[model samples]
Target: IIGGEFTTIENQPWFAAIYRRHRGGSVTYVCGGSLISPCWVISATHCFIDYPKKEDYIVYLGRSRLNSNTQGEMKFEVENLILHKDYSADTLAHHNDIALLKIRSKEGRCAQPSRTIQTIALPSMYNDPQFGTSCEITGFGKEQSTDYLYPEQLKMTVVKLISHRECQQPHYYGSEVTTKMLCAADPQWKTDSCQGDSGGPLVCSLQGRMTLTGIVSWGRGCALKDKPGVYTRVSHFLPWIRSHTK
Candidate 1:
């Protein structure tokens, strides 16, 4: 990392970087995502609305920094985009914030496995832990709100899961958080996912493997005293995810 220390991206293979060509045909970094399979990735629905053409949307895997060319670097073109029917940018409640992107090569095959590029497993089909117990979120988002740019390297931090009841209290996010959401925060430190981290993975070790449990959806701020970061509860949408993924 340019300004700090953190885990290597090779350790987290399922993580992905979303990119798009903006005005003047300049490719710019957008958001984050998680690779659930060789051809399917889960991301935020809001990432795709009113933006670049489908062909211009790219997914980068097996890389740590956005600009640096890491060893596991690979790119894929988006073949299809599916956003949750209930998602609404109008209210920005971010409910059902999930979206799926089908990636493929010109030959119509999925990405091949490599040390730095691999799919992450979903949680148990029939069960989700009441609390995350312990979960980790990673992204290249800026380390501080004062910074106008994202970090040059991947960064990660552990945050505790907050109970839904407590999360919805008027003191917190109130009615904004629903059963479809998960709340997490670092109790002792002012650390959490930042602006560019949305749609990234909130993974936990389940059955000895890193299983994705949530997707970074929204938050009151990066990390505040009482407010925690919100996520799209993965378990709540397992049925939808299974139906769409191959």
Candidate 2:
């Protein structure tokens, strides 16, 4: 993430690192996700479109740094992968970009909660946050769009929610910003999620706790002026998430 501060897993325990394993026995961090339950993780559909094989994906929880397995970190292979049926990659507007990953252990159990590992709360159905509401996005993505290197440690930054109208302005995303998507960015365009941050959580404090509000979906460029990061509005898919999880 650009113009962000380093954070630890203890602070964002629900955060997950999605990885792709190659045929050559090498692995690369592909995207981000959030643990919503012991066996379920939510991410972006685009992250798994090319790598359709479930065997090619791996997920890590309670991890703060990349390329280093510190204490309390746990890894699990994906048991099932489900992408939104309406997700389309052909268009510039990524609608229904959400996806769910069912993770499990050898014995069929899933993640066991710990201080550094827990599920994030999902926002209530249809409960959309007001425009300009301050939210937080965390990721280990690149600092710039042109950079090939990703951060070794997790990072987070504050972003204010932008209204659909503002995001739809001719100077901005225009009609490409759909109702199912939400836009947010730093006021100065100094901090934003970049490449490799796809599918990560955009959390906001709802009621009394941090609630999953959006999933990092796409953007024009890193920290670009007038081009805010677009996210999949989680509230719109509450039923879809519930129906498939159980």
Candidate 3:
């Protein structure tokens, strides 16, 4: 996260960690994910589009600390890696950037929920968010391009939803903003998701319930002045989610 602060897992229990391995057996953090069910996780399709192999992924849950695996931490192997058929990161237009990971323990059972680990509910409508709705995003990502602070711990930031029309201004993403995506930002650019935060949750409270409105997909850069963060609209994929998760 860029200009983000540390947070507890209880504040964002559904968040997860995605890791990539190296030739010498060293592991590195790749992206973030959100647990939507005992056996299903929601993330950005771009993460899996490049590395489509299910074997290369390892999912970690139920913890705020990435440096160590304490009692509350649990690891799962990906049994299935599914991406939206239309996702295309190769082109400048990254459409349908959403993916699902089927997780299971080594013994072949679903993940067990704890106080600091649970599921996040998806949004329920096709309508857009208010112009200035307050929302939050959590991730174990870099602080900045030059800071070199990568995945030391989990962090979160408060941001306001930016309307698609305003976000499409020439100063921002311009015509790149689409109905399938939404944008959010701290007016001061003091808080925003950064590199490696892809596939994490962009949560907003609705009707007294925290809803997963979007998934971190892409951005021009981290915490830029007028360029807000873009995310995959979760509500648009509700039908697809139900089809596979059911």
Candidate 4:
């Protein structure tokens, strides 16, 4: 997260880190996700497009730091990975870029609820956020687009929703932005979710409760002026998500 402040898992318990296990006993953080249910997580399809093997992924929950282990930290193995059938990485727009991960413990049990771990609430169908609405994005992504180093601790920053009309301007993302995607960024272009933050939740307050509104998907660059970060509109896929989770 660029230009963001450190946050704890206690404040964002649904935040999850998805890691790719490499050969020779090494694991690397790949993308971020949100715990939607005890056995289900929501992420971006592009994160696992290249790595088709579901067994190679691990889900970490209730973790505040990437390098340090916490007492409340929990790990689970992925039992299933399901990407949107229409999701396509062939284009730069990344349409339908959503995925679901069904996780399980070594004993074949689902995730357990705790003080530091819980599921995030999903937005009701057709709950479209209005323009200029303030929202929060949390992730352990890179601090800058040109840097290779990702922050050790989770970070969060406030961003305002950008209208599709504004986001489609030639000066901005042009026509590449679509209805399936939602755009948001800091007004000063100082904060944004960068590389390694894909699939994280874009949460906003709705009806007096925090709701998962979008999933971090793609962007031109990190915190670039006129270029807001794009996300998969979670409200647009409520049926798709509910079908698989059931």
List all candidate RMSDs to the true structure.
2.3, 1.0, 1.5, 1.0
Which ranges in model 4 have alpha carbons more than 4 Å from their true place?
none
* Candidate 1 TM-score to native: 0.92
Candidate 1 per-residue C-alpha lDDT over 1-246 given as tens digits, one digit per residue, 9 for 90 to 100:
112247666877888888987668988887889999889989888777666257778888888988877885878889987788878653446777898988886667777889888898888664455564778898887788678888878888888788988898999888888988889887764678878888798888777878888898888667777778888888888889988775
lDDT of each: 0.80, 0.92, 0.85, 0.91
- By the lDDT metric, which is better: model 1 or model 3? 3
Steric clash pairs (candidate 4): none
Model 4 is weakest, by summed lDDT over 10 consecutive residues, at 84-93
- Let me know the TM-score candidate 3 reaches against the reference structure: 0.95
Error of 2 at 17 (Å): 0.6
Name the regions of candidate 3 deviating beyond 4 angstroms. 90-93
* TM of each candidate vs. truth: 0.92, 0.97, 0.95, 0.97
Better of 3 and 4 by TM-score: 4
Tens-digit lDDT track for model 4 on 122-231? 99987967999999998999998888789998998889999999999999988889888999999999999899889999999988989999999999888999989999
Runs in model 2 lying further than 4 Å from the true structure: none
Worst 10 residues of 1 by lDDT: 1-10
Give the RMSD in angstroms, all C-alphas superposed, for model 2: 1.0
